[PDB]
Symmetry: C3
Subunit: 455 residues, 3 copies
């Protein structure tokens, strides 16, 4: 016999209510199999992959990941795929929860302005990736065409306080990380599996700061975690806690009490978390340069009473989270726009640089620029800075070592190069520093930095 | 006590019958431990890694992966390794099912024209990789020196309708993907873990089209799946279905009802599949650029009656499978040979281009070149094509965007660049198009494309 | 209720005794929860990452991996982090066994010459990675800032004969593998996940030869295996045996009888091994170029009686282990130092070349240089070598093929290029060969090879 053998659809046809990340539809709360009509529309559109960095995403339902679909094992699903008239490419779908060739792909081929449909029975409970299946498949997936479908067990999942939807992806831009402007897809980086960004939910900061996920001490949180790839395998981890359980796809196996778990490319898991003490818990890909250098950082923020018997310490700060500690980095978006418009002010630069200074510079120089006498020199009221701003550009790009004197005190240490910062970033950071802490003001431009970098 | 403690070998010595991929030897069907004599011969030889692309493989038994070995837990295995006189390198073996230093390596060192032997007891049931263990080990493995040995449990595995043998590997050629000719091994790409091909069973198309695996609706299929590496980890997946179970090596754990499973480099699993509806099921590495851009695609084709209650849709086609939808791409091999011989005809090019057009171009332009009026312009009887074939070369290499007029209708869309196509491929595709659909004929040469690419 | 609910700390405060790799502290052997005081000091210092290759490591307790910490589930841990005054960077810690934001990171921020402390309850049994959490986090981890903490179950782990501590990491030097000198950290390679070295316990050869782990036939060995990353996932494997069991972190799941297991970046496992026959067992990352080309090789050497019924063969040798078969390669360190000092003698070169010849050249030419008549030409008393030492430099760098005559016999084979050998390595190998086996003596310098390579 086939699995999911719960008889013909009964009751009324149900129009599925889909949700945008990071939200999940309500439990189906149903004891009979139904005919479920799913309507999903492909939209190609520019969105911000990072502040001041645009990208042409290809999306299921206007978001990356695409809309979440929730059905019950044994349901008959009538799947309608529309391709918005504004699209340039044809699209289709492969849902991993489908039993049949291509997971739906041949019968869902949809040209711009058209609609397709096919029907399948959801034989297998589990959490499943869906994605586009149109040649060149890797390009479509790299552009954002993936999401999750949950096929519930007949009795439903256990009740929890919160359910969230998080999906990792690797992205391939022609430009480097945080290089501003509209960035094309880069096929060469994609084939080589060399992403410029590794993200949760389609953008840097999508789930940090004021966009964090929330829960309270004592509550349970279920996260449906996908890995759209196209190429990477996530060493998926929660900083500061453990997963009560991890279950992949529709697997019978459930792992309990683990911290780091590998999510295949194209894979998905259901994880459960119990909040014990307050603070920010960081979901990461623990291939650490992804998390800390390419954007693969999301936050679950827990509110409630401290418990000093369990953890005596403090909330996370910019030392660990860097420039994502703060609510947002909107000033960077604004400064980038002003640069494009030819209206960039000193204050635009100052506010962008303030945002970027956090972690990146403050770890050593402090958030107030005071440093630590004899160990980390001050940027506040710094004679050394004021004496030569071109030197300061070179220091950021190329580092500094050896004995120096700053504000009457000797330092003999090492500031590593920070060459991966883009010209605008260096310029804005230095303009912030120059306009703070009784420093002499003025500004550094992106062009100034470009010239120094080329020397 | 040691595992596999079933007493001394009894009965008669057994000469193992080894099989070539994708076939498996019969179940041992035996209730006593035996002395099993295994004879395996290393052969170095050129084979086609892709159409018109030769590679010097180093093989156990003339194939990649090497011959399949099947024994019973508790057997005494007398292992004979021969190195064919034509070999240039020495070789040896490490079988993961051996208990002892090197898995056999020191006692199996075999110079060209020599033979070695050693004896081991198969203490541990499971599916195991074997591979060469000769410095430089990575080179030997990269050249194809890996296979599987099954050590059955004493009672045998459960009966199934079909057993097949599939093994992934990563390959490192000096030339790029689909660049024709005899391709040397590339040590630099290998050290960097940057393969040019990622394959099942040693070649593009080894298990697609007319070389697909087969079964019928209702049947069970067991696949012994290896990952020879040397370097990659497979996000192993079956498009359009689920694995009933997955068991790694000799592990006690068995996962049931999963879709995507990570196979370590050097690892192996036994997977089981039950055929429910007809069509082509695609085994892939779901690190998707491997599957769709480097060759990591194999097919299990299921014949039988459709079941519209389970899946209403169609068989896979070139939109998803690309140029591997068709039975084979023999015309590409023939055209490449003709180029070498200096006898390349227009028709040779046309037939090669026909094969390559599928998916690559047809996804948008259609298999009949009609496109979709106002959305995808026609290649059939195309005034725009005819007006300027050099422009058409540039369009394939570099893409096209902006408003154009084709056959009296305006288009305002984007054709992405296709720069990864090789000169011969562009030339053959365009020659096919020019000689189809009332287009003006003539031909485009590889040299013509080379010149355009260099501009 | 919280896990680890064993009541308030009792008895006396315990000062934890930490161990350096590859050793482990004794079992806690305690039936009550305690207050455990842990004191760990960060030290930045140069050490040898390979012979003659220095690197500035950042360490917890002076070693890579850092000191091992062993506590009991339910303990209250008062964690003190000191940063040695000689440090240039600030540091902190994230222990995966902590419940709380950052795993301790915000409350452990410690400038050079300072100390910090925080308290946590160890709620969860398991083996856990700890690492630095200071921006830029990837740099700190890449420089060696990781280790393991074991949180025992209340009843303790089962008794074994030996417990060892092994931790993989990926490292990023500006220079290539085995290029001599003090090598800076390379941020570009790190972001691209392109390590120059992949190591166990912080150095090539850290656990090979005279630094191998030991046990006897019949004994059980537990290894606490970490993967500090920062970036790689280990296809962790024991050559020549099986793991009796593998348990990740504090997971409920235990896998039994497996050979190859994936350890996530930031992950950790407890593996168990039962020694059955004598010899050297190789722990590797089975992404094979890491193991055999980047240093990811460690040894568990088992002493005791052979059992020919289980394995008839020989101990490992340089064919498989290469230049790590021997007790050590101290001669390479000495020759490199002599080069720096301007005192390099012929004999210094000869002894370094002797060490490097093993495997690298001996696999084909034999340890005595005799080759195999008509198959592999001799280096012993070689007329061809003597006739043209510049040609011999080119042969090592660029390979050799075609018909040649050596000592009166024709060869018609292929010696692959060995271009990844550094100039000093080629020079020392050839000087060894020239000064052995009745060859004419003299020497080849690194500068000689540099010139040939540049041709
Ligand atoms: C972040 C991009 C950042 C800025 C900006 C910055 C500036 C800076 C200047 C201008 C100097 C010169 C001396 C002065 O105090 O005016 C300087 C010197 C040092 N820095 Fe710095 N610095 C930034 C980042 C960092 C980081 C992240 C660290 C710590 C890892 C750091 C440290 C130092 C040190 C030490 C010096 C002195 C070097 C010496 O030769 O002794 N900086 N920095
Ligand atoms: C496959 C290699 C392929 C070929 C060949 C090809 C040819 C081609 C030509 C010659 C034109 C010019 C106009 C004409 O119809 O003669 C052209 C234009 C467009 N193409 Fe194309 N094309 C190939 C592949 C693809 C693929 C895979 C797509 C869809 C993703 C595609 C689409 C288009 C579009 C759109 C245009 C018009 C661009 C515009 O400026 O409006 N082509 N193609
Ligand atoms: C290790 C770095 C190494 C050295 C040194 C080396 C030297 C060497 C020389 C000098 C020759 C010339 C002929 C002679 O015998 O004097 C030579 C030729 C061949 N080699 Fe070699 N060789 C080194 C390594 C290796 C390895 C690892 C192999 C086997 C894979 C190998 C093989 C050969 C072969 C074969 C030849 C002859 C080539 C031919 O044209 O027939 N060498 N080697
Ligand atoms: Cu699409
Ligand atoms: Cu998929
Ligand atoms: Cu070999
Ligand atoms: Cu192996
Ligand atoms: Cu640190
Ligand atoms: Cu961590």
């Amino acid at each position: 016999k086939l699995p999911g053998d719960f008889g013909p659809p009964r009751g009324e046809p149900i129009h599925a209510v889909l949700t945008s990340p990071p939200l999940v539809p309500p439990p189906v709360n149903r004891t009979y199999p139904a005919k479920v009509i799913v309507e999903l529309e492909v939209v190609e559109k520019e969105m911000q992959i990072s502040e001041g960095v645009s990208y042409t995403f290809w999306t299921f339902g206007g978001t990356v990941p695409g809309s979440f679909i929730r059905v019950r094992q044994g349901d008959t699903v009538e799947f309608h795929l529309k391709n918005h008239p504004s699209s340039k490419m044809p699209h289709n779908i492969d849902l991993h929860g489908v039993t049949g060739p291509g997971g739906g792909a041949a019968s869902s081929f949809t040209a711009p302005g058209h609609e397709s449909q096919f029907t399948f029975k959801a034989l297998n409970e589990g959490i499943y990736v869906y994605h586009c299946a149109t040649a060149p498949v890797g390009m479509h997936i790299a552009n954002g065409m993936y999401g999750l479908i949950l096929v519930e067990p007949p009795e439903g999942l256990p009740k929890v306080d919160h359910e969230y939807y998080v999906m990792q992806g690797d992205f391939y831009t022609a430009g480097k990380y945080r290089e501003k402007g509209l960035q094309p897809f880069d096929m060469e980086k994609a084939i080589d599996e060399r992403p410029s960004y590794v993200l949760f939910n389609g953008a840097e900061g999508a789930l940090t700061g004021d966009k964090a996920l929330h829960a309270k001490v004592g509550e349970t949180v279920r996260i449906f975690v996908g890995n759209g790839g196209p190429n990477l395998v996530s060493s998926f981890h929660v900083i500061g806690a453990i997963f009560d359980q991890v279950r992949y796809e529709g697997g019978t196996n459930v792992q309990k009490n683990v911290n780091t778990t590998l999510i295949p490319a194209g894979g998905a898991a259901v994880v459960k978390f119990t909040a014990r003490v307050p603070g920010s818990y960081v979901l990461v890909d623990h291939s650490i340069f992804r998390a800390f250098n390419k954007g693969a950082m999301a936050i679950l923020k827990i509110d409630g009473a401290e418990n000093k018997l369990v953890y005596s310490g403090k909330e996370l700060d910019s030392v660990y989270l860097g420039d994502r500690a703060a609510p947002n980095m909107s000033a960077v978006t604004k400064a980038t726009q002003a640069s494009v418009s030819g209206t960039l002010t000193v204050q635009d630069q100052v506010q962008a640089g303030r945002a970027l200074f956090a972690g990146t510079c403050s770890v050593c120089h402090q958030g107030n620029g005071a440093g630590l006498p004899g160990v980390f020199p001050p940027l506040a009221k710094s004679d050394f800075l004021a004496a030569d701003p071109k030197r300061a550009m070179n220091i950021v790009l190329h580092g500094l070592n050896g004995k120096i004197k700053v504000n009457g005190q000797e330092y003999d240490s090492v500031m590593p190069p920070m060459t991966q910062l883009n010209d605008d970033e260096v310029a804005n950071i230095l303009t912030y520093v120059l306009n703070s802490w009784d420093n002499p003001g003025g500004r550094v431009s992106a062009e100034d930095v470009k010239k120094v970098r080329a020397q």
